[PDB]
Every structure is written in structure tokens, then in C-alpha cells.
Scaffold this active site. Structure first.
Site, PDB file in Angstrom:
ATOM      1  N   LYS A 170      -2.485   6.226  -4.074  1.00  0.00           N
ATOM      2  CA  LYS A 170      -3.618   7.118  -3.888  1.00  0.00           C
ATOM      3  C   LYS A 170      -3.415   8.526  -4.418  1.00  0.00           C
ATOM      4  O   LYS A 170      -2.318   9.080  -4.336  1.00  0.00           O
ATOM      5  CB  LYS A 170      -3.941   7.208  -2.393  1.00  0.00           C
ATOM      6  CG  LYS A 170      -3.863   5.879  -1.644  1.00  0.00           C
ATOM      7  CD  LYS A 170      -4.149   6.041  -0.164  1.00  0.00           C
ATOM      8  CE  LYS A 170      -3.887   4.750   0.591  1.00  0.00           C
ATOM      9  NZ  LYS A 170      -2.451   4.425   0.648  1.00  0.00           N
TER      10      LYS A 170
ATOM     11  N   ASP B  68       0.846  -1.193   0.000  1.00  0.00           N
ATOM     12  CA  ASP B  68       0.000   0.000   0.000  1.00  0.00           C
ATOM     13  C   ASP B  68       0.880   1.241   0.000  1.00  0.00           C
ATOM     14  O   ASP B  68       1.659   1.445   0.929  1.00  0.00           O
ATOM     15  CB  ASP B  68      -0.918   0.027   1.221  1.00  0.00           C
ATOM     16  CG  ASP B  68      -1.863   1.217   1.205  1.00  0.00           C
ATOM     17  OD1 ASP B  68      -1.690   2.152   2.017  1.00  0.00           O
ATOM     18  OD2 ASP B  68      -2.772   1.229   0.359  1.00  0.00           O
TER      19      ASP B  68
ATOM     20  N   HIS C 248      -7.566   9.406  -2.108  1.00  0.00           N
ATOM     21  CA  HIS C 248      -7.114   9.419  -0.718  1.00  0.00           C
ATOM     22  C   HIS C 248      -8.114   9.939   0.311  1.00  0.00           C
ATOM     23  O   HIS C 248      -8.316   9.316   1.354  1.00  0.00           O
ATOM     24  CB  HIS C 248      -5.796  10.192  -0.634  1.00  0.00           C
ATOM     25  CG  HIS C 248      -4.867   9.691   0.425  1.00  0.00           C
ATOM     26  ND1 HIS C 248      -3.497   9.743   0.288  1.00  0.00           N
ATOM     27  CD2 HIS C 248      -5.106   9.149   1.645  1.00  0.00           C
ATOM     28  CE1 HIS C 248      -2.931   9.253   1.379  1.00  0.00           C
ATOM     29  NE2 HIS C 248      -3.886   8.889   2.215  1.00  0.00           N
TER      30      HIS C 248
ATOM     31  N   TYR D 242       3.234  10.108   0.967  1.00  0.00           N
ATOM     32  CA  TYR D 242       4.135   9.444   1.914  1.00  0.00           C
ATOM     33  C   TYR D 242       5.597   9.843   1.663  1.00  0.00           C
ATOM     34  O   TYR D 242       6.453   9.643   2.526  1.00  0.00           O
ATOM     35  CB  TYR D 242       3.965   7.917   1.856  1.00  0.00           C
ATOM     36  CG  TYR D 242       2.597   7.419   2.306  1.00  0.00           C
ATOM     37  CD1 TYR D 242       1.676   8.284   2.906  1.00  0.00           C
ATOM     38  CD2 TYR D 242       2.211   6.093   2.090  1.00  0.00           C
ATOM     39  CE1 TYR D 242       0.404   7.842   3.266  1.00  0.00           C
ATOM     40  CE2 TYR D 242       0.946   5.644   2.449  1.00  0.00           C
ATOM     41  CZ  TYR D 242       0.048   6.517   3.029  1.00  0.00           C
ATOM     42  OH  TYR D 242      -1.217   6.077   3.344  1.00  0.00           O
TER      43      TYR D 242
HETATM   44  N1  LIG Z   1      -5.943   5.790   3.258  1.00  0.00           N
HETATM   45  C1  LIG Z   1      -5.605   6.488   4.330  1.00  0.00           C
HETATM   46  O1  LIG Z   1      -6.110   7.577   4.615  1.00  0.00           O
HETATM   47  C2  LIG Z   1      -4.561   5.844   5.250  1.00  0.00           C
HETATM   48  C3  LIG Z   1      -4.342   6.375   6.521  1.00  0.00           C
HETATM   49  C4  LIG Z   1      -3.492   5.758   7.443  1.00  0.00           C
HETATM   50  C5  LIG Z   1      -2.839   4.592   7.069  1.00  0.00           C
HETATM   51  N2  LIG Z   1      -3.036   4.043   5.796  1.00  0.00           N
HETATM   52  C6  LIG Z   1      -2.286   2.832   5.403  1.00  0.00           C
HETATM   53  O2  LIG Z   1      -2.380   1.895   6.467  1.00  0.00           O
HETATM   54  C7  LIG Z   1      -1.052   1.477   6.774  1.00  0.00           C
HETATM   55  C8  LIG Z   1      -1.020   0.935   8.193  1.00  0.00           C
HETATM   56  O3  LIG Z   1      -1.447   1.905   9.170  1.00  0.00           O
HETATM   57  P1  LIG Z   1      -0.410   2.754  10.057  1.00  0.00           P
HETATM   58  O4  LIG Z   1       0.901   2.909   9.398  1.00  0.00           O
HETATM   59  O5  LIG Z   1      -1.123   3.975  10.471  1.00  0.00           O
HETATM   60  O6  LIG Z   1      -0.185   1.862  11.374  1.00  0.00           O
HETATM   61  P2  LIG Z   1      -0.227   0.363  11.917  1.00  0.00           P
HETATM   62  O7  LIG Z   1       0.117  -0.596  10.876  1.00  0.00           O
HETATM   63  O8  LIG Z   1      -1.490   0.212  12.627  1.00  0.00           O
HETATM   64  O9  LIG Z   1       0.961   0.393  12.948  1.00  0.00           O
HETATM   65  C9  LIG Z   1       2.297   0.637  12.501  1.00  0.00           C
HETATM   66  C10 LIG Z   1       3.126   0.674  13.764  1.00  0.00           C
HETATM   67  O10 LIG Z   1       3.027  -0.545  14.512  1.00  0.00           O
HETATM   68  C11 LIG Z   1       4.337  -1.118  14.640  1.00  0.00           C
HETATM   69  N3  LIG Z   1       4.281  -2.601  14.484  1.00  0.00           N
HETATM   70  C12 LIG Z   1       4.100  -3.307  13.348  1.00  0.00           C
HETATM   71  N4  LIG Z   1       4.086  -4.621  13.610  1.00  0.00           N
HETATM   72  C13 LIG Z   1       4.266  -4.692  14.930  1.00  0.00           C
HETATM   73  C14 LIG Z   1       4.373  -5.862  15.680  1.00  0.00           C
HETATM   74  N5  LIG Z   1       4.276  -7.074  15.138  1.00  0.00           N
HETATM   75  N6  LIG Z   1       4.599  -5.703  16.998  1.00  0.00           N
HETATM   76  C15 LIG Z   1       4.697  -4.496  17.547  1.00  0.00           C
HETATM   77  N7  LIG Z   1       4.581  -3.383  16.824  1.00  0.00           N
HETATM   78  C16 LIG Z   1       4.384  -3.449  15.501  1.00  0.00           C
HETATM   79  C17 LIG Z   1       5.210  -0.492  13.581  1.00  0.00           C
HETATM   80  O11 LIG Z   1       6.560  -0.378  14.019  1.00  0.00           O
HETATM   81  P3  LIG Z   1       7.843  -0.673  13.112  1.00  0.00           P
HETATM   82  O12 LIG Z   1       7.555  -0.111  11.787  1.00  0.00           O
HETATM   83  O13 LIG Z   1       8.857   0.053  13.886  1.00  0.00           O
HETATM   84  O14 LIG Z   1       8.006  -2.129  13.206  1.00  0.00           O
HETATM   85  C18 LIG Z   1       4.598   0.883  13.519  1.00  0.00           C
HETATM   86  O15 LIG Z   1       5.093   1.692  14.561  1.00  0.00           O
HETATM   87  C19 LIG Z   1      -0.211   2.726   6.523  1.00  0.00           C
HETATM   88  O16 LIG Z   1       1.215   2.588   6.485  1.00  0.00           O
HETATM   89  C20 LIG Z   1      -0.804   3.140   5.204  1.00  0.00           C
HETATM   90  O17 LIG Z   1      -0.231   2.418   4.123  1.00  0.00           O
HETATM   91  C21 LIG Z   1      -3.904   4.666   4.891  1.00  0.00           C
HETATM   92  O1  LIG Z   2      -3.682  10.149   5.056  1.00  0.00           O
HETATM   93  C1  LIG Z   2      -2.772   9.357   5.390  1.00  0.00           C
HETATM   94  O2  LIG Z   2      -2.550   8.278   4.798  1.00  0.00           O
HETATM   95  C2  LIG Z   2      -1.893   9.731   6.568  1.00  0.00           C
HETATM   96  C3  LIG Z   2      -1.230  11.074   6.409  1.00  0.00           C
HETATM   97  C4  LIG Z   2      -1.428  12.077   7.357  1.00  0.00           C
HETATM   98  C5  LIG Z   2      -0.778  13.311   7.246  1.00  0.00           C
HETATM   99  C6  LIG Z   2       0.080  13.551   6.172  1.00  0.00           C
HETATM  100  C7  LIG Z   2       0.289  12.556   5.219  1.00  0.00           C
HETATM  101  C8  LIG Z   2      -0.369  11.325   5.340  1.00  0.00           C
END
Ligand SMILES: NC(=O)c1ccc[n+]([C@@H]2O[C@H](COP(=O)([O-])OP(=O)(O)OC[C@H]3O[C@@H](n4cnc5c(N)ncnc54)[C@H](OP(=O)(O)O)[C@@H]3O)[C@@H](O)[C@H]2O)c1
Ligand SMILES: O=C(O)Cc1ccccc1
Length: 314
Positions: A76, A42, A109, A47
Site C-alpha cells: 500500500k 498483505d 492506504h 509496517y
Molecule cells: N488497510 C488498512 O488500513 C489495514 C489496517 C489494519 C490491518 N490491515 C491488515 O489486516 C491484517 C490483519 O489485521 P490485524 O493485524 O489488525 O489483526 P487480526 O488479524 O484481526 O488479529 C491479529 C492478532 O490476533 C492473534 N491471532 C491470530 N490468530 C489467532 C488465533 N488463531 N487464535 C488466537 N489469536 C490469534 C495474533 O497473535 P499472534 O500474531 O501472536 O499469533 C494477533 O495478536 C493486518 O496485519 C494488515 O495486514 C490493513
Molecule cells: O493503517 C494501518 O494499516 C495500521 C497502522 C496504524 C498506525 C501506524 C501504522 C499502521
């Protein structure tokens, strides 16, 4: 293992997120992920690391570890590129950074359109975000022609409430239905109503921030932590799995695509071992009862935007 989209394509239920993944760590992270078995990445222009993600993908393709058809790459369209003439150009920039000739899924997005420019969050003299006069329907028609031109195989949305999704579904002359609606989902924000609605219309739901996003920049020491919740630790211990593994298996059994982020090799590998166990119906109902309606991503600077998605119940 893979969910069927309305365009006939198969989407890997598990994918690697890249928000907050530093440019100097994400290439190696994506390389390890592909070796481990991940076939879904993703991404997003905002980013600021798509070039580095692309380096990883190209290395694995050259290595013959995977062929392009096996990968499911998602990116996105940012808010500053919602106008008709800017959509194709934004997609092309992402394609060049990733070094691909087509994307598997391209999402809008956020439903909110901002004033075009170099700033991702354009501000005025007062300090608030400057909106664009464009609407969701005009942006969707521009996304539809990317499919007609072969740039993307499927189009979708992200952070759209049920009424905004309705608008698209009821749009005159609709050519392509949204294949996916990627929303925030975990035990503290179960989203049962939005999920049931989307699933009834044949729209696949992708759950982002499944672990509660412990690395978000706006994090506070008094905010609730999923990874440390004693009640969730108990369920994990009962299955001889880690809390993250339970938090990742949770959405899969709700028939949702899940995309946890990690730049740590052992964690990337750990997050993959979620296909060998099952949560009981009791475990699922209990996890669902933990809902507090707590959002990690609320886009608080756009609370006054005409298209802000979080005023409606769902
Ligand atoms: N469409 C949107 O508006 C939007 C918004 C937010 C997110 N997203 C997508 O969703 C993805 C995931 O969400 P997110 O990045 O917000 O957070 P998340 O995946 O919920 O959490 C990421 C965090 O958890 C840690 N982590 C991962 N595996 C772990 C494990 N097995 N044990 C302990 N800690 C762990 C990671 O640390 P390390 O990296 O240090 O291991 C990182 O600090 C994003 O990267 C993005 O691609 C999309
Ligand atoms: O929308 C997202 O995926 C998370 C995000 C928050 C603020 C700036 C860039 C991206």
C-alpha cells in the site's frame, strides 16, 4: 478458493497480514505460511518490515516451493506519498524491499494525504497532522500509470467510504477501476452497506482486522473482545472449530477476502483450516446481529482532514 478481479486476475480468498509483525519474526512467519498453503501476503511500507517479508518470499521462490505467478503480493501507498511525483518512487521502494519486479495489487492506504517528509505522521507546532493539498483523483491518476508501466497488475483503495469510491468511478477519463477496497470488517462492524455498494460495482472487498486486532497498541481493558465473546464461542463449539476459525470463515461466506495476522506457526496453520466446514445461514445472520459499529482503526488524529472517510454513514 480464489476470487476474480476486474483485471482478470485471481485473488486468494485467504491471506497473511503483517501489521505489528516484528522484523525478527515475520520472515519465519511468511516462510511457514507459504509451506502451509498461503498464497496471499498483505504488506505495507508503513509496517516497517517489508524487507524482512521479502527475504521470506525470495527463499521460497529459490526453493521452488512456489513460482511467482502463484503468489499474490499486496502492498500500500502511504499518506505522505500522495503527490503525483512521489507515487512511482514509493512503489519502487516497496518493490526493492520485497525484492520483486511487480506487485499483484497496490492500494492507496488511506484517502487522506499528508505533507511529504520522513515522518509517517507529520505534525506542526500545535501537534496535529499537516495535510497535503492533493486530492483523491490526482493520486488515482498516478496509480493508473503504474499499471501502464508494468510495476503493478492491479490498483485499489483502502478505507474509502462510498462517496470517495463514487468520485473515482465518476472521474473524467477513468482508465482503471479500483479492483479492491480493503476495509475493517468483523462481527462488531459488519459493514453491510459499504459491502453491498462495492460488490454491486464489481469491486472486491477485503476484510482486515477479522479477529478484532487484539494486539493493537491503543488497546484498552474495557474494549470488547471477539475472540472471547461467549456467543461466538458457542458457535465455534457447535462446529468443533476454534473461535478464530469461525471469525475467519465468517467473511469468506460473504464473498470477502480475509487477511488475519499471525507470527505464531501453530496459529498460522490453524487459521488455514477454514475450507473444510460451513456456517449455516442461521449462524451467519446471528453473527451479523452482533454489530455495534465499533472500529479498531479510526485514524483519530485526522478527524479534521478534508478527506477523513468516517464522517459519512458508509
Ligand atoms: N488497510 C488498512 O488500513 C489495514 C489496517 C489494519 C490491518 N490491515 C491488515 O489486516 C491484517 C490483519 O489485521 P490485524 O493485524 O489488525 O489483526 P487480526 O488479524 O484481526 O488479529 C491479529 C492478532 O490476533 C492473534 N491471532 C491470530 N490468530 C489467532 C488465533 N488463531 N487464535 C488466537 N489469536 C490469534 C495474533 O497473535 P499472534 O500474531 O501472536 O499469533 C494477533 O495478536 C493486518 O496485519 C494488515 O495486514 C490493513
Ligand atoms: O493503517 C494501518 O494499516 C495500521 C497502522 C496504524 C498506525 C501506524 C501504522 C499502521
Amino acid at each position: 478458493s480464489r476470487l476474480l478481479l476486474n483485471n482478470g486476475a485471481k485473488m486468494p480468498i485467504l491471506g497473511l497480514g503483517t501489521w505489528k509483525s516484528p522484523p525478527g519474526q515475520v520472515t519465519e512467519a511468511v516462510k511457514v505460511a507459504i509451506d502451509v498453503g498461503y498464497r496471499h501476503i498483505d504488506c505495507a511500507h508503513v509496517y516497517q518490515n517489508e524487507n524482512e517479508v521479502g527475504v521470506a518470499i525470495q527463499e521460497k521462490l529459490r526453493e521452488q516451493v512456489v513460482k511467482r505467478e502463484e503468489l499474490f503480493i499486496v502492498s500500500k501507498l502511504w499518506c505522505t506519498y500522495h503527490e503525483k511525483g512521489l507515487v512511482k518512487g514509493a512503489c519502487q521502494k516497496t518493490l526493492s524491499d520485497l525484492k520483486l519486479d511487480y506487485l499483484d495489487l497496490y492500494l492507496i492506504h488511506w484517502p487522506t494525504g499528508f505533507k511529504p517528509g520522513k515522518e509517517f505522521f507529520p505534525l506542526d507546532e500545535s501537534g496535529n497532522v499537516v495535510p497535503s493539498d492533493t486530492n483523491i483523483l490526482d493520486t488515482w491518476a498516478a496509480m493508473e500509470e503504474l499499471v501502464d508501466e508494468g510495476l503493478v497488475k492491479a490498483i485499489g483503495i483502502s478505507n474509502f467510504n462510498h462517496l470517495q469510491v463514487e468520485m473515482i468511478l465518476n472521474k473524467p477519463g477513468l482508465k482503471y477501476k479500483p479492483a479492491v477496497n480493503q476495509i475493517e470488517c468483523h462481527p462488531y462492524l459488519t459493514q453491510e452497506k459499504l459491502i453491498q455498494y462495492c460488490q454491486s460495482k464489481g469491486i472486491v472487498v477485503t476484510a482486515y482486522s477479522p479477529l478484532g486486532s487484539p494486539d493493537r497498541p491503543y488497546a484498552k481493558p474495557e474494549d470488547p473482545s471477539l475472540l472471547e465473546d461467549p456467543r461466538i464461542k458457542a458457535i465455534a463449539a457447535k462446529h468443533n472449530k476454534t473461535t478464530a476459525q469461525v471469525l475467519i470463515r465468517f467473511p469468506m461466506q460473504r464473498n470477502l477476502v480475509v487477511i488475519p495476522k499471525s507470527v505464531t506457526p501453530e496459529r498460522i496453520a490453524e487459521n488455514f483450516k477454514v475450507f473444510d466446514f460451513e456456517l449455516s445461514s442461521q449462524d451467519m445472520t446471528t453473527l451479523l446481529s452482533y454489530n455495534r459499529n465499533w472500529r479498531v482503526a479510526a485514524l483519530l488524529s485526522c478527524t479534521s482532514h478534508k478527506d477523513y472517510p468516517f464522517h459519512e454513514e458508509f
